[PDB]
Write a protein that binds this ligand. Structure first.
Ligand SMILES: CNCc1ccc(-c2[nH]c3cc(F)cc4c3c2CCNC4=O)cc1
Ligand SMILES: CNCc1ccc(-c2[nH]c3cc(F)cc4c3c2CCNC4=O)cc1
Ligand SMILES: CNCc1ccc(-c2[nH]c3cc(F)cc4c3c2CCNC4=O)cc1
Lengths: 147, 147, 147
C-alpha cells in the first residue's frame, strides 16, 4: 500500500536522523571540551562540524513532516495526526537550535566568550528539549508500525 | 620547482588529515562515553563513524608517503629522507590503529566486552603515538619549505 | 527490531555488499595488471580504489553481524546461531583481507615490491575464502527466510 511505502520511508528517515543526532552530540561534546581547554581552533572546527550535522537534522525533520502529512492523506489515523504534531514541534525546535548554534559560531568567530557561552548553553538546553520530542516521535512511530 | 609544488600538495593533505583526526578523536571519545554508559547501540554507531574516519586518515597517510617519495625523487641528495621515514612510520601507526579498531568493532558486534576494551584502549594509545608522529612530520616539512 | 524487518534489511545489506565485492574484485584485478605492466602510478590509483571498497565491505560485514545478532536475541534457535556464526567468520575474514590490503598499499607506497606482491596474493586468497563464506551465508538465510 502507499501507507506501507510512506511508513517505510519514515522509518529510514528516523533511523538516519538518530545517527546524525548522535554525531551532533559528539561534535557538541568535542566543542565543549575544546572550549574548556582553551583550544580555539579545535573549537572552531567542532562548531563547523556540529553545524553540518545540525543542518542535516533540520532536513530530516522537514522530510518527516512532509511524509507524515502524506500518510494522513492516504491513511487517516489518530497516531499519524499525533506524530505530525510532534514532528512539527521538533522541526521548530531544531530550527531554534540551528539559530542558537549560528550565534555560537559567530561569537567564537568574533572572540566574544560571553555571547558564546550563553548561546552554547542555550543550544544544549534546546538539544535536551529536542531529544525529548524525538523520543516522543519515535514512540509514536512504533505505535504506527503496529497498526 | 616541482619540489615546492609537491611540498604544497603535502601541506594541503596534512591540513585535511588534521581535520579528519579531530573528527576521529571526537568519535572515539563519544564511543568511550557510550561504552561507560552502557549505551550499546549508540556505541555501535560511534564505532562505525570512527571506522569511516580511520579509513580516511589511512588514505591521507598513504598519499603523504607517496608525495614524499615523489619529493625524494626530485632531490639529488637525501634531504627528504627523514620526512619520508617519519611519514612511513606514521602510516604504519595509523594502519596499526585501523587493525586494532577492526578488532574492537568486531568484539563489540560479537558481544565480547573484554576483547573490545583491550582493543579500544590500544586504539587510543596508538592515537597518542600517531599524534606525536603527525606533529613531528609537520615540523619537519616546515623545515623543507622556504617560508 | 522485528524479525521480518531484520531479515529484509539483511537481504538488502548483502545485495549491496555483493555489488561492492564485485567492484573490489575489478579494482584488485586492475591493480594486478598495473603491477605486472610496471605502471606504478596506475597501481596507486587502483589500490586506493580497492582500499575504499574494502572499507565499505568491512562496514557491511559488521552490519550483517549486528543484524544477525539481533535476530538471535529475538528468535534464539540453532539456525539463528548458525547464521550468526557464519557472519562472524565472514567478518573476521574480510577484516583480515583489510589488514593484508593495508600491508600491500603501504608496501607499494614505500616502494617495497617484494612485500607488496606477497601481500597482494594473500589478499586475493582471503577474498576467495570470504566469497565461500558469503555464499554459505546466503544459503543459510534462504533457510531462515523460508521463501
Ligand atoms: C551532553 N550532551 C549535550 C547534548 C545534548 C543533546 C544534544 C541534542 N540532541 C538532539 C536531539 C534532536 F532530536 C535534535 C537536536 C539535538 C541536540 C543539539 C540540538 N539540535 C538538534 O537538532 C546535543 C548535545
Ligand atoms: C581523549 N582522546 C583520546 C584520543 C586520542 C588520540 C586519538 C587519535 N589521534 C590521532 C592522530 C593521528 F595522526 C592518527 C590517528 C589518531 C587517533 C585514533 C587512531 N587513529 C589515528 O589514525 C583519538 C582519541
Ligand atoms: C581474479 N580475481 C581475484 C579476486 C578474487 C576475489 C576477490 C574478493 N572476493 C571477496 C569476497 C568477499 F566476501 C570479501 C572480499 C573479497 C575479495 C578481496 C578481499 N576482500 C573482501 O572483502 C578479489 C579479487
Amino acid at each position: 500500500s502507499d501507507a506501507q511505502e510512506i511508513l517505510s520511508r519514515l522509518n529510514s528517515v528516523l533511523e538516519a536522523a538518530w545517527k546524525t543526532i548522535l554525531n551532533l552530540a559528539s561534535a557538541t561534546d568535542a566543542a565543549e571540551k575544546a572550549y574548556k581547554e582553551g583550544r580555539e581552533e579545535d573549537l572552531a572546527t567542532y562548531l563547523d562540524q556540529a553545524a553540518s550535522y545540525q543542518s542535516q537534522v533540520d532536513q530530516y525533520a522537514v522530510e518527516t513532516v512532509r511524509l507524515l502529512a502524506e500518510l494522513k492523506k492516504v491513511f487517516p489515523d489518530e497516531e499519524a495526526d499525533r506524530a505530525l504534531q510532534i514532528a512539527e514541534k521538533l522541526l521548530k525546535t531544531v530550527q531554534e537550535a540551528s539559530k542558537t548554534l549560528d550565534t555560537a559560531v559567530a561569537a567564537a568567530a568574533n572572540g566574544d566568550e560571553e555571547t558564546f557561552a550563553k548561546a552554547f548553553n542555550q543550544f544544549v538546553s534546546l538539544g535536551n528539549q529536542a531529544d525529548t520530542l524525538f523520543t516522543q516521535l519515535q514512540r509514536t512511530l512504533t505505535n504506527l508500525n503496529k497498526k
